Design a protein around this ligand. Sequence first.
Ligand SMILES: [Ca+2]
Ligand code: NA
Lengths: 63, 281
Amino acid sequence: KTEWPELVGKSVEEAKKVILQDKPAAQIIVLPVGTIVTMEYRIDAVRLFVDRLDNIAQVPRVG
Amino acid sequence: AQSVPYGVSQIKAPALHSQGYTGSNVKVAVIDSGIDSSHPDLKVAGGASMVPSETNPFQDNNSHGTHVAGTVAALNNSIGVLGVAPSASLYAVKVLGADGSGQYSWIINGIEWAIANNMDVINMSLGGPSGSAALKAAVDKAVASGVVVVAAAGNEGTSGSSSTVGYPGKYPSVIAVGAVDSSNQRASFSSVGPELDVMAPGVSIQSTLPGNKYGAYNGTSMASPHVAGAAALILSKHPNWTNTQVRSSLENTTTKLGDSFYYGKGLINVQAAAQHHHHHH
Ligand SMILES: [Ca+2]
Ligand code: NA
């Protein structure tokens, strides 16, 4: 499992919990949606893009 | 002893080096997370930070900008790796913070700084799924001003028949670069779509990391500086070629790979690009 479209619109907290169940060794970073980010691909990482309410605003994926 | 990462050989940069062309006097802005200027295998010529809480562009708290910079221009000497354009004038234009993220206005301010400082090439190993009129206006203005602008296509992989190229690579004025490995196979994470222009190596790319380190990274971020570096080699050999001509020379001389949706025009070949007559190999 490397994408979590079912997390869009959920709280950042529930997203972290779900992703760590599926990928316990994940390196999670939370960033603001609508920012620009580096385009390295890190197989161990999941970037979570949140809106200003701290809900997930983009499908989380590995990278 | 210095090592030549496979990607530098793959795009045929050593052919330019043997002709005596290494990017000398070409100014390349790495618009990114900063560049560690203390690394002994880099020489940073200038730069500026647009990140309000990280004001030193010569401090790279992420590592990404320093890796990208080494692919562009790691020094030709007896240590570390060799950059595509090892004599390039490298500028650290820091618009991303430690966490690898930046606001659109930061990126735009860095593009503006590059134009105002007469950069010949911009590399943007960065992107997001949405554009803005003002981002588009900044990259269009840089191109109108004569700058070669190169960006990572994105690491969104495939999504059926939809384009997954991010911005600013998705803008027509910017060259969007996807990633292949050493066998010329598209990396599975590499974005796809009609906006994909060319490919370059972006799997297991060895380059400079902060604190005098080296390491292998993956991403369309690693592919883009092969192409920015190539543009600098071509300009050092043809200092009067316009950005228009440099872009067509790279497009028109790729080694064609698969369908253009997945591979664009194929793998860049800077040897063929820097000849006067261009054709695909
Ligand atoms: Ca070196
Ligand atoms: Na483009």
